[PDB]
Amino acid sequence: MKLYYKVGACSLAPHIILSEAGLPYELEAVDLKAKKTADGGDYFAVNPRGAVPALEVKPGTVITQNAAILQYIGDHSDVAAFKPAYGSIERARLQEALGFCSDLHAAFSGLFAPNLSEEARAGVIANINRRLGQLEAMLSDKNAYWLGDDFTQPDAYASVIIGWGVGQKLDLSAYPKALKLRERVLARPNVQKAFKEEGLN
Amino acid sequence: MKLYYKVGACSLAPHIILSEAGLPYELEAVDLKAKKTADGGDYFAVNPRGAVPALEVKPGTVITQNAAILQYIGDHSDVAAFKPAYGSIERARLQEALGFCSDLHAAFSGLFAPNLSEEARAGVIANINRRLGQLEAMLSDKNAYWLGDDFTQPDAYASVIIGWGVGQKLDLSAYPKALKLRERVLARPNVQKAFKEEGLN
Numbered sequence: 592m593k594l595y596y597k598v599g600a601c602s603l604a605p606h607i608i609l610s611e612a613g614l615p616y617e618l619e620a621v622d623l624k625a626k627k628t629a630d631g632g633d634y635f636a637v638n639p640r641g642a643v644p645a646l647e648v649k650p651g652t653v654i655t656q657n658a659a660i661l662q663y664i665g666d667h668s669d670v671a672a673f674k675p676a677y678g679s680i681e682r683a684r685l686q687e688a689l690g691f692c693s694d695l696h697a698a699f700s701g702l703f704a705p706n707l708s709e710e711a712r713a714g715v716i717a718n719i720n721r722r723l724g725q726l727e728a729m730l731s732d733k734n735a736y737w738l739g740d741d742f743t744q745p746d747a748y749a750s751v752i753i754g755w756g757v758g759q760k761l762d763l764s765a766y767p768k769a770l771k772l773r774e775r776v777l778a779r780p781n782v783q784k785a786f787k788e789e790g791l792n
Numbered sequence: 793m794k795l796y797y798k799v800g801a802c803s804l805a806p807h808i809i810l811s812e813a814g815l816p817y818e819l820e821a822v823d824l825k826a827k828k829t830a831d832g833g834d835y836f837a838v839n840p841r842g843a844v845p846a847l848e849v850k851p852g853t854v855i856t857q858n859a860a861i862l863q864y865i866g867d868h869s870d871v872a873a874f875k876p877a878y879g880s881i882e883r884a885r886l887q888e889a890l891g892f893c894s895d896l897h898a899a900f901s902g903l904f905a906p907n908l909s910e911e912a913r914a915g916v917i918a919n920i921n922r923r924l925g926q927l928e929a930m931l932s933d934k935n936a937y938w939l940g941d942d943f944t945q946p947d948a949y950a951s952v953i954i955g956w957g958v959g960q961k962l963d964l965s966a967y968p969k970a971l972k973l974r975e976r977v978l979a980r981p982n983v984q985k986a987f988k989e990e991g992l993n
């Protein structure tokens with residue numbers, strides 16, 4: 592399978608999950624500004640929404656949307672925690688966390704709009720604080736990872752999102768559970784492998 | 793199961809799917825402004841995110857997020873189209889459309905922010921047009937419903953979203969596939985039943 596990505600963007604979550612699944616996969620960096628694949632082709636032909644991630648499962652079949660991609664990868668892995676049975680409450684919990692990651696993403700994405708006024712930015716920041724506060728309340732000191740004992744796809748997604756906060760030099764020290772979750776995720780060898788594959792430290 | 797909703801909001805999609813599944817269910821209207829249940833209790837205890845929908849599967853187990861709720865309902869129905877096998881490409885397509893419905897929702901939701909300046913509103917409207925253009929391109933004249941021959945959860949979700957456009961007196965006539973999809977969905981007896989249950993025509 593071939594993952595269309597941009598370094599450090601939300602495609603990093605499926606990149607991580609592909610690495611964790613042990614998945615043979617390939618990687619295609621996308622010029623997101625010009626909407627071009629690496630060979631100069633039109634990325635809109637791959638994803639008409641023009642966003643990453645996209646995952647070519649096989650020639651002619653490209654899945655878009657992080658929730659769909661993350662669960663496709665999981666459902667075709669041998670990692671039981673990545674593929675709970677539909678819906679066992681576990682599947683519902685998996686999808687709820689992924690759904691909430693999309694709420695988190697929507698909040699952070701305002702930060703990256705062009706010609707963002709200071710006033711508009713303040714509103715974005717307040718929303719980010721609110722979403723991060725909600726994430727922190729959702730996480731529990733009783734669980735090693737978001738959903739419990741096992742690392743799952745929303746752990747990778749949450750960690751990338753929190754990563755955008757760090758990269759924007761935002762103070763996340765009031766969200767210690769979220770920071771600890773990301774610390775745990777980044778320590779994983781197959782996570783470090785994915786980072787390395789995007790030329791990231 | 794008990795669905796927490798607000799009349800006409802995104803909770804209408806799971807309301808519809810509950811009706812279509814034949815599901816026995818109950819309904820709890822939420823004062824979204826004050827974040828209160830009907831008995832005056834604190835809605836944040838039901839959904840700490842403070843949003844609808846939420847679905848009590850049983851006492852003590854409340855699922856939030858439309859993608860999770862819509863698939864939980866489907867997976868516990870007898871409607872095969874609502875529960876493709878994980879991931880058969882059909883499951884991935886289901887989740888991709890639901891993921892995109894969340895992109896659509898995020899665009900429309902800007903329209904309902906308080907103290908929305910005209911200038912800010914123009915930006916929201918341009919995003920809505922872009923998301924609707926993407927939806928229209930995703931739909932195919934070869935398919936009776938979004939994903940093919942069968943009505944599925946994203947049909948209900950898309951129809952509610954387009955409904956917000958109508959209610960805001962927005963011109964959607966440039967999206968004939970989207971309008972036809974909504975027309976088809978609204979004609980369904982179990983959809984009309986759900987509308988009736990929220991006191992809607």
Ligand SMILES: N[C@H](CCC(=O)N[C@@H](CS)C(=O)NCC(=O)O)C(=O)O
Pocket residue numbers: 600601602623624641642643644655656657658693891892895
């Ligand atoms: N609903 C999301 C949307 C993905 C998205 O907005 N991705 C961003 C990168 S994090 C993007 O490619 N934006 C388009 C752009 O930056 O030009 C999903 O889960 O796939």
Ligand SMILES: N[C@H](CCC(=O)N[C@@H](CS)C(=O)NCC(=O)O)C(=O)O
Pocket residue numbers: 690691694801802803824825842843844845856857858859894
């Ligand atoms: N990620 C969404 C978020 C749901 C959402 O934002 N719902 C709106 C209603 S359409 C809401 O209850 N907003 C809170 C409010 O209006 O105070 C989901 O799929 O459940």
